[PDB]
Write a protein that binds this ligand. Structure first.
Ligand SMILES: [Mg+2]
Ligand SMILES: [Zn+2]
Lengths: 419, 214, 52, 94, 95, 153
RNA sequence: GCCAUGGAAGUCGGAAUCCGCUAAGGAGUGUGUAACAACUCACCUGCCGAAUCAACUAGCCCUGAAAAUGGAUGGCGCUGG
């Protein structure tokens, strides 16, 4: 399914960060990604001879890890019938962790989609970097920012915005020198401005060209007072590139905010991007907040209560978040219940106690909130919208409003409506 | 009429000797480097050592035309022409101001201000960017935290932290520029302090600069 | 721009109505059957959608 | 018991609206300034200058003229029980 | 009306009605009242027609004539709330 | 600013969910520390809910006990006190005495929130039926107990 | 209101559904509400004075009912037949 696919993209992102985080105290793990074409017999041959060699490495801890890891992966493939289709991930090792845990480890899996790596790595940590590279599939979009003040170059992923380079040039200004020069000032100044244009042009060729062929997918030129148009129409600007001029964008003051505005003018050009869909959705959500219609709902305290009652058209959530619900549980009455506690009251506080009875009150195995939405969103009837916290609106709503909220089915004025 | 009314009107702050300052408007090379700007504070006795701000370079001013006349001394509050013998030349900004080398002027990355929001118009959540306008100085800026709302008429500022603010509500807010930048106080210099909020074809807000974080 | 009384007045004559599911006709709000013969005095109505 | 003022029933006598503060923040002045009552912004908070009698003997109480009685919840004349005649063992008293 | 003001003028001592600048249209509506009807602009009111007469039928039909004459074609009427509308029906002298 | 407020509190037991900040919050005293102080001052009801009034000022709150009808009948019952959770299948088992109900009718008539004996026993027992009990029989029983077996002064 | 619950305080669920003034007032139809606010509902006084209201069923008529040379209750025509 498609919705389950997107759940795997975030789920895989979260799993990968862990596989990358685990560490050895002073030892090496074998990571072995086997590709789909090979035969098991051939793998057992290549490795059994590499095995008779690994038989005589000098170190004790490394040697035993290699030799024991080779026997383990063979036993894991003894579990695998054939090199399975579309890849084979394998991760054997001896990971130490906090609390002093000399832990042996074996993590074997058929991959979900085709995987290309033919990894072999006796190393301190595991590697699903292949998985995240496989997950992040969208082209990078460069941005050139020009101004009489100074330049700036920056790229643009699906959600993430990056900055590549920026610089200055001391182009002396219009007043320059009066009487004698003023009449021939605009001509000399246009030459000098064009020389600045040559330098900007050179940077765009450097960046956006790749062997007279663009490697990055899009290129958004940008400037004010017709800086970008000279860059577009200039002959230094490459013809194969004129074929692919995606857009030129005007800005004010000249810079990063203007870089952001030029992205806002782009919006319709980056329709495929979730960042653009987010910009448009959160643009409507702020239109709801501006208007009195009272569709908005906000905060986990109110939004989760609002979700429970229903009423929720769009539930805007950051894909990671890391906020939790403390499920309390009793012995006798069997009343499981969730509680949303602030940073002060959650960490150091005496509210998880029965007190009346005279006991300390526990909680039971929690669950992720986003995985819970994906599990039972059709039950509630709410449009889950996956946002990051990188973008100006997503990062903002993420920091202040818990990276969660929603457009409601109807009006609920909170200042009007006590309770 | 207008110019006769100026003749009958002497009501203007001369801007008199204080800690010497000179905000730099623009620059160019004509056998050196001339720059323009209104002396918001203090004096500058041409053959004398200045320092710029906030990047902080020592610098001697080669020549001046008080608007259109060669002079040695000058009091503040005047559109001055100032040609420098720059040791630092190409990483100077239009906007970095000269100050006294001893009586330095504050400048700072973090600062608080009472902003009166005219037209964002969207909600102004923590972390929006614009440009910060300080008469000659001008840097791109972001606001990290949003302290609180305040009324326009009879302004008694509230206790509890608000969750958001809509288009018009006035508020006290902290503004972080990208780089180092010339900021003054409303008490010390309002001429040095009153600043702008800026993005698209939309005026965001007026700003009221209060603090200078070092 | 315009007074809310005179607004609600135009709401009266244009927006506050009922529709026949069948012939998409326009009826008075406190109706029970349609008027048109082509639909057959249908009980099946709905209120006109209010503009936001 | 003084109940809410009705925006609609007939008036036996003149209904009155005394000069008294609203008890709110910045609100829409159009309800008071529509009719004809002097209302000033005494620093944010609105203050009433002059006293004017809106409704006369026998007049329909509008919602706008009703709103200030609904805010005060103070009837000029209370809903009640009116005496007709006394009757004592076959004896009428006017 | 919302934005464009409707310049109204009476011809033939309240028999005829010229209505100009409706939605900024160049067409102008020369509406004719019925016989035995007296159109009149009231005083002390900015936007107020007054139709007087004996026969209610002729009065009310002529009212609907002007009403349906000023009608918005091809547009969302729920939004564009323009045009003349009847407010208060009463008598010349009360009883 | 004085303000009275009704609260069907969990009792001596500290309730998880609170409805105190919406009514109390605008005035001034912190709502939860009062909720805990109210449950601590209460105590002997312990598990079951009590309608706690709160006369609130700008600085701080004031507590006043209002024993409910259903609550006073179940205390007449000897019940297990329980936590906020209040387990399922709590049908009350015992006998509400007719004299005890007359006493609770006197308690509600003392708060001055209902009728002369006929009405106040009924409101307290109609809520008792919500409790899930019997006054050695329901009102069909008490009609016969009333007839030729009256407990009236 | 208790039980549910987090809250059903008239308006998920689930337990409730007895009493008061009574002319009548549900632990509540909708808008609008987690429940109130604001608009609003069942129920009754004021006047009113004879027949009224609900659900079904079958009789006639109507809707449902579109095809190609110009067209057929046999035609003309027929509505106190
Ligand atoms: Mg159209
Ligand atoms: Zn129809």
């Amino acid at each position: 399914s498609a919705a389950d696919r997107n759940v795997e993209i975030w789920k895989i992102k979260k799993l990968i960060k862990s596989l990358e985080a685990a560490r050895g105290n002073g030892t090496s793990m074998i990571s072995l990604i086997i590709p789909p074409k090979d035969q098991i017999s051939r793998v057992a041959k290549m490795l059994a001879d590499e095995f008779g060699t690994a038989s005589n490495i000098k170190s004790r801890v490394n040697r035993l890890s290699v030799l024991g890891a080779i026997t383990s992966v063979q036993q894991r493939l003894k579990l695998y019938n054939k090199v399975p289709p579309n890849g084979l991930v394998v991760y054997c090792g001896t990971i130490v962790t906090e609390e002093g845990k000399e832990k042996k480890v074996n993590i074997d899996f058929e991959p979900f989609k085709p995987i290309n790596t033919s990894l072999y790595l006796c190393d301190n940590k595991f590697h699903t970097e292949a998985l995240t590279a496989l997950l992040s599939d969208d082209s990078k979009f460069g941005f050139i920012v020009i101004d009489g003040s100074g330049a700036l170059f920056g790229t643009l992923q699906g959600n993430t915005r990056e900055v590549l380079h920026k610089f200055t040039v001391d182009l002396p200004k219009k007043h320059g020198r009066g009487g004698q020069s003023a009449l021939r000032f605009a001509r000399l100044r246009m030459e000098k401005r064009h020389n600045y244009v040559r330098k900007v042009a050179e940077t765009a060729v450097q960046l956006f060209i790749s062997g007279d062929k663009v490697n990055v997918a899009g290129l958004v030129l940008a400037g004010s007072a017709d800086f970008k148009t000279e860059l577009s129409q200039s002959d230094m600007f490459d013809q194969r590139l004129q074929s692919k001029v995606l857009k030129l964008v005007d800005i004010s003051y000249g810079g990063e905010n203007g870089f952001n505005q030029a992205i806002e003018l782009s919006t319709e050009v980056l329709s495929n991007v979730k960042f653009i869909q987010e910009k448009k959705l959160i643009g409507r959500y702020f239109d709801e907040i501006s208007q009195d219609t009272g569709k908005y709902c906000f905060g986990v305290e109110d939004t989760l209560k609002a979700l429970e009652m229903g009423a929720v058209e769009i539930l805007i959530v950051y894909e990671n978040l890391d906020i939790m619900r403390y499920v309390l549980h009793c012995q006798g009455t069997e009343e499981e219940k969730i509680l949303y506690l602030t940073p002060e009251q959650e960490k150091d506080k005496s509210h998880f106690t029965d007190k009346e009875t005279g006991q300390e009150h526990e909680l039971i195995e929690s669950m992720p909130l986003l995985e819970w939405f994906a599990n039972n969103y059709k039950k509630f009837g709410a449009t889950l919208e996956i946002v990051t916290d990188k973008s100006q609106e997503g990062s903002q709503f993420v920091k202040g409003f818990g990276g969660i909220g929603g457009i409601l089915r109807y009006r609920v004025d909170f200042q009007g409506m006590e309770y | 009429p207008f110019i006769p009314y100026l003749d009958n009107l002497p009501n203007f702050n001369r801007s008199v000797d204080g800690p010497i300052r000179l905000p730099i408007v623009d620059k160019y090379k004509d056998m050196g480097t001339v720059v323009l700007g209104k002396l918001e504070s203090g004096s500058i006795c041409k053959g004398q050592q200045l320092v710029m701000m906030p990047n902080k370079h020592n610098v001697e001013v080669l020549g001046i035309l008080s608007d259109d006349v060669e002079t040695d001394t000058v009091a503040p509050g005047e559109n001055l022409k100032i040609r420098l013998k720059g040791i630092e030349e190409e990483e100077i900004l239009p906007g970095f101001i000269l100050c006294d080398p001893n009586n330095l002027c504050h400048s700072g990355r973090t600062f608080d201000a009472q902003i009166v929001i005219i037209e964002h118009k969207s909600i102004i959540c923590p972390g929006y960017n614009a440009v910060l306008h300080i008469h000659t100085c001008i840097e791109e800026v972001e606001i990290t935290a949003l302290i609180c709302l305040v009324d326009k008429k009879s302004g008694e500022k509230s206790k509890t932290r608000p969750r958001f603010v809509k288009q018009d509500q006035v508020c006290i807010a902290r503004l972080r520029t990208a780089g180092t930048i010339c900021l003054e106080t409303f008490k010390d210099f309002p001429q040095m302090g009153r600043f702008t909020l800026r993005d698209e074809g939309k005026t965001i807000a007026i700003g009221k600069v209060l603090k200078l974080v070092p | 721009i315009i007074e809310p009384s005179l607004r609600q007045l135009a709401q009266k004559y244009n927006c506050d109505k009922m529709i026949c599911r069948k012939c998409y006709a326009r009826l008075h709000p406190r109706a029970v059957n349609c008027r048109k013969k082509k639909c057959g005095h249908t009980n099946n109505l709905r209120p006109k959608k209010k503009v936001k | 018991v003084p109940a809410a003022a009705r925006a609609g029933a007939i008036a036996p006598c003149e209904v009155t609206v005394p000069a008294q503060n609203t008890g709110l923040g910045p609100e829409k002045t159009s309800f008071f300034q529509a009719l004809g009552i002097t209302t000033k912004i005494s620093r944010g908070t609105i203050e009433i200058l002059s006293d004017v009698q809106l409704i006369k003997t026998g007049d329909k109480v509008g919602a706008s003229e009703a709103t200030l009685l609904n805010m005060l919840n103070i009837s000029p004349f209370s809903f009640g029980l009116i005496i007709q005649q006394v009757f004592d063992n076959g004896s009428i008293y006017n | 009306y919302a934005h464009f003001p409707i310049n109204v003028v009476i011809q033939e001592n309240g028999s005829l009605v010229e209505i100009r600048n409706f939605l900024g249209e160049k067409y102008i509506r020369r509406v004719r009242m019925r016989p035995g009807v007296a159109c009149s602009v009231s005083q002390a009111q900015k936007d107020e027609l007054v139709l007087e007469g004996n026969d209610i039928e002729l009065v009310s039909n002529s009212a609907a004539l002007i009403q349906q004459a000023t009608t918005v074609k091809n547009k969302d009427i729920r939004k564009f709330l323009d045009g003349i509308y009847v407010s208060e029906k009463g008598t010349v002298q009360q009883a | 600013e004085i303000k009275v407020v009704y609260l069907r509190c969990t009792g001596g037991e500290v309730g998880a969910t609170s409805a105190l900040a919406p009514k109390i919050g605008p005035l001034g005293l912190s709502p939860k520390k009062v909720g805990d102080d109210i449950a601590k001052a209460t105590g002997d009801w312990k598990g079951l809910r009590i309608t706690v009034k709160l006369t609130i000022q700008n600085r701080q709150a004031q507590i006043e006990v209002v024993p409910s009808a259903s609550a006073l009948i179940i205390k007449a019952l000897k019940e297990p006190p329980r936590d906020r959770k209040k387990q399922k299948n709590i049908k009350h088992s015992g006998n509400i005495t007719f004299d005890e109900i007359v006493n609770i009718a006197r308690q509600m008539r003392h708060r001055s929130l209902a009728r002369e004996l006929s009405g106040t026993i009924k409101e307290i027992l109609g809520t008792a039926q919500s409790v899930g009990c019997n006054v050695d029989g329901r009102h069909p029983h008490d009609i016969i107990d009333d007839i030729n077996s009256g407990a009236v002064e």
